[PDB]
């Protein structure tokens, strides 16, 4: 019997990205070698199988710093973090391999799928 | 130059509602007289002008319990909290006045607008 506001989910995501920009209520730092990225644990868990596993673990849920595998590319992580908060993926010939490898590690299935398709089209 | 995943924002919201259902990483209790509602501060701020003002205040941002005005109807609040996490508003003849009054207090402009329109259609 409900009515639905079509734009509500995108409006919520836009506001969560505005909170991230202003560093409001961010509760974790993701460290990717020499780079640091502040974020909201809930958004990360909502977008990534890896973060869902980390922040549901009874010990790791309480950490304020998470260090990723040294093989992870910071630019690839940055592109994926932007996608989590905006639905837009900045996929380019020069970053697709790093984005795909990062999305595989983060367990972001739809991103991995589009990367595979864009690579297949070139070869 | 980005590509966009159409369903991403709705998928994020669905996962945030699943976290709320399972009481995962909820960080505030909203008290509406005899009722309590657990939620995520970020989602509340993303949906309500009142919660945005509360959780950006340097003292109130740190409270784990927020008590609403005693005039606020718990069912109306519950319906609006469900709308925040799902984009679906359970508006009925028997609850529209309480939902509209609650949405005015919470500063949820689009909800107030649809309530006004449904009331105008009856009178």
């Amino acid at each position: 019997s409900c009515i639905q506001f079509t734009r509500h989910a995108s409006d919520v995501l836009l506001n969560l990205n505005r909170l991230r920009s202003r560093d409001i209520l961010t509760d974790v730092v993701i460290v990717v070698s020499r780079e640091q990225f502040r974020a909201h644990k809930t958004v990360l868990m909502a977008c990534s199988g890896l973060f869902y596993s980390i922040f549901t673990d009874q010990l790791k849920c309480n950490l304020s710093v998470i260090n990723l595998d040294p093989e992870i590319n910071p630019e690839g992580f940055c592109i994926l973090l932007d996608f989590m908060y905006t639905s837009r993926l900045n996929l380019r010939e020069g970053n697709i391999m790093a984005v795909m490898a990062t999305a595989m590690y983060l367990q972001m299935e739809h991103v991995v799928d589009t990367c595979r398709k864009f690579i297949k089209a070139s070869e | 130059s980005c590509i966009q995943f159409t369903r991403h924002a709705s998928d994020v919201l669905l996962n945030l509602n699943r976290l709320r259902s399972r009481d995962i990483l909820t960080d505030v209790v909203i008290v509406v007289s005899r009722e309590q509602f657990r939620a995520h501060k970020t989602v509340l701020m993303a949906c309500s002008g009142l919660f945005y003002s509360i959780f950006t205040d340097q003292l109130k941002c740190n409270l784990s319990v927020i008590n609403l005005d005693p005039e606020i109807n718990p069912e109306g609040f519950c319906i609006l909290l469900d709308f925040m996490y799902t984009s679906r508003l359970n508006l009925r003849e028997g609850n529209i006045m309480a939902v509209m009054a609650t949405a005015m207090y919470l500063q949820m402009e689009h909800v107030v607008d649809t309530c006004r329109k449904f009331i105008k259609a009856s009178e």
Binding site: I3, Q4, F5, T6 | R88, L89, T114
Partner: peptide, 5 residues
Amino acid sequence: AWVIP
């Protein structure tokens, strides 16, 4: 906006 879902 509002629609019947």
